[PDB]
Symmetry: C2
Subunit: 177 residues, 2 copies
Amino acid sequence: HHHGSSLISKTIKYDPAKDKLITLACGCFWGTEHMYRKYLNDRIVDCKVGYANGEESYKRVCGGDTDFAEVLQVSYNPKVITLRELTDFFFRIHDPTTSNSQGPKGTQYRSGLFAHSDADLKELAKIKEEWQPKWGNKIATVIEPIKNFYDAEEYHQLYLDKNPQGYACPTHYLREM
Amino acid sequence: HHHGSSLISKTIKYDPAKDKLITLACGCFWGTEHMYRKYLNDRIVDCKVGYANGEESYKRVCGGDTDFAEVLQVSYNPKVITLRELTDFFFRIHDPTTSNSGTQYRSGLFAHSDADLKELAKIKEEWQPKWGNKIATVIEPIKNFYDAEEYHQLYLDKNPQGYACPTHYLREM
């Protein structure tokens, strides 16, 4: 029905009457999930790992489109925790600068913020600029409106192809084998 | 005192009278930790993330030697789960072949005994046909282990921001 259901985790706890979403790319998503759960589990509604890409202004990613990034989608109540606090945390749990951006080439691990609203896109761009003096080295984080999100397990099923063992997929998951 | 104390995680629950250790590399260690805890938590004693290398890229690994791998160290009671079962699980949670594909994310098994080294080599050989005989997993005696927190304190002393370290951890800034 093109109301953006393709942008939300199928399994995440989320009520649009009171919650908001933010989708975060900063390395292997089990790492991102560990950090948010370790430090902020009692202040977020839910989070789910998966793959996402953005409206943008080579090598397939685990059988899917070349631009997919490993992400954590976070559902939160803005009266409990702000987007600013969630984003400040993002900019402290990885190296978001060009010293960690992929140039040896696995783009699925890129630093990225996928915004679920026009207003969010603007606030995130502001927060990135405010982190630049502290990071010093050029921040590489891309900020894009979200275009697709799939829960991890769902994505592995969608792009199964003829590859149940996940050859050439660097992501941990229990293969069907 | 040169008895291999360094090869064990400082924080792991481990009793040498009944438990054994295996140190596993198969991607980012938070991924490896998530897999063992999600599926095998009731069958292992404990597990801890860190960086290890073994008795055998130019890029340093979070400031340390180029051969360090991100690993999970697992402590287990062989009467509750066997080394083979842990390794069978290892070979089903990642692509251990040359199609996948820094080097700290390589597939590897770091053995804590000579007997384990021989058993692991035999398991790898038995697994070859299922992975099209292209298993790239390195099997080596473990040479060093550092808790992730301890390694960062050691090789990132002058780099609190962890520039060029791909590992997730909370930078103090």
